[PDB]
């Protein structure tokens, strides 16, 4: 009831720009200090941009001059305005409540991540990993979805449309000699029940807004 | 702009174990530190502000100090979900900066895996490609081997692999391995086979097919 969930993130060549929004549940933007947080590998978690409740804003050394963050109350959407990326600025971005002015984000959305490069998008394809007895062991059985050939990042995937969340393991992506990623997501169910349950894997990738839900039937 | 550091990079601990982690700022910041604590895939979570002030619905067991330039959280009864990386951040000069991370992992019993094979699909092959995926499940320690083997002959440089984060329920790891080839070449083999080594296992494990 009280969240916050950020979109916009994908390809973004060097130079371009991107509108993250970050819509927010449970409270009013209007009246809390809303900041903008990305995390990377090598620098870490870097504080980017805040906006007050009274309309200041104030912005890290590094984004000065480039971004641009606003709010509109009406939607009570959060929105961070990138122009002129550079290779840098490749991050999972987070929009964060706080209070005080003091900075302590309280409250901390999903994450976005925007991967600023040349190179083109591509979206996956989804083959089933379909439970056969070579995928069972003492009365449990192991099923699956391959998950191959996509750029950027990130691939998203679900069970039962978010039903089905025990057991179930998404595996970190590997990157292909293509330099395509590619990822497995499985599950490991009773065997008993292969004949009754229904196992459909649900895959998003975003920056090709591509959706695909895959029934996993045993062999 | 303040630095701040933190120490161990990371450490292994028992359940029940009192782990403390130690934060560091490069100047005086008074008590204006706070703590989060994040697991891979998900977003930060507030845990401690002020240097000792609880999050509301964190557990007792999760306790914080300092004042000035040295600062340590401290968790008491260590359990399974409490694994993840915590930083500490600075809110005493602008901008606000947060430290490079603890990562905390955590020892249980050895555990073999449990070693599942799954042919490639038939929509796959159609477009001229064959994977072939064998999959680790539920073990501990992390290390672990697999070897494919066509018709009874090693392979090299023809598959990948990748081992998830530590299960924040049971402490153990699991890992997939894909081996990738032409239609054409697959079509031409009889038994596909990786196998397994690991401390849980006095002998390798093969988990094969035949087609």
């Known amino acids: 009831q009280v969240q916050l969930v950020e979109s916009g993130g994908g390809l973004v060549k060097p130079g371009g720009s991107l509108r993250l929004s970050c819509a927010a549940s449970?409270?009013?933007?209007?009246?809390?200090?809303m900041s903008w947080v990305r995390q990377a590998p090598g620098k870490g978690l870097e504080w980017v941009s805040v906006?007050?409740?009274?309309?200041?804003?104030y912005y890290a050394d590094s984004v000065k001059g480039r971004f641009t963050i606003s709010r509109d109350n009406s939607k009570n959407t959060l929105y961070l305005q990138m122009n002129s990326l550079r290779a840098e600025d490749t991050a999972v971005y987070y929009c964060?409540?706080?209070?005080?002015?003091?900075?302590?984000?309280?409250?901390w959305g999903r994450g976005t991540l925007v991967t600023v490069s040349s190179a083109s998008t591509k979206g996956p394809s989804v083959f089933p990993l379909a439970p056969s007895s070579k995928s069972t062991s003492g009365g449990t059985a192991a099923l699956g979805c391959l998950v191959k050939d996509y750029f950027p990042e990130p691939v998203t995937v679900s069970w039962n449309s978010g039903a089905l969340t025990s057991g179930v393991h998404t595996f970190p992506a590997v990157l292909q000699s293509s330099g395509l990623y590619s990822l497995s997501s499985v599950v490991t169910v009773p065997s008993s029940s292969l004949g009754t349950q229904t196992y459909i894997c649900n895959v998003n990738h975003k920056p090709s807004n591509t959706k695909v839900d895959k029934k996993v039937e045993p062999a | 702009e303040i630095v701040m550091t933190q120490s161990p990079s990371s450490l292994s601990a028992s359940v029940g174990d009192s782990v403390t982690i130690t934060c560091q700022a490069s100047?005086?910041?008074?008590?204006?530190l706070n703590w989060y604590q994040q697991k891979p895939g998900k977003a930060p979570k507030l845990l401690i502000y002020?240097?000792?002030n609880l999050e509301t619905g964190v557990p007792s067991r999760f306790s914080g100090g300092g004042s000035g330039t040295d600062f340590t959280l401290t968790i008491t009864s260590l359990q399974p979900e409490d694994i993840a990386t915590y930083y500490c951040?600075?809110?005493?000069?602008?901008?606000?900066?947060f430290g490079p991370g603890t990562k905390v992992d955590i020892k249980r019993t050895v555990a073999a895996p449990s070693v599942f094979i799954f042919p490639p699909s038939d929509e796959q092959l159609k477009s001229g490609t064959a994977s072939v995926v064998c999959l680790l499940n539920n073990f501990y320690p992390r290390e672990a081997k697999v070897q494919w083997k066509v018709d009874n002959a090693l392979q090299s440089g023809n598959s990948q692999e990748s081992v998830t984060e530590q299960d924040s329920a049971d402490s153990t790891y699991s890992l997939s391995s894909t081996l990738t080839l032409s239609a054409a070449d697959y079509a031409a083999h009889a038994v596909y086979a990786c196998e397994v080594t690991h401390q849980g296992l006095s002998s390798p494990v093969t988990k094969s097919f035949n087609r």
């Open positions: 964060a409540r706080g209070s005080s002015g003091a900075w302590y984000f309280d409250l």
């Open positions: 449970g409270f009013t933007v209007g009246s809390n200090y």
């Open positions: 906006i007050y409740s009274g309309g200041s804003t």
């Open positions: 100047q005086d910041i008074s008590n204006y």
């Open positions: 002020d240097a000792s």
């Open positions: 951040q600075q809110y005493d000069n602008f901008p606000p900066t």
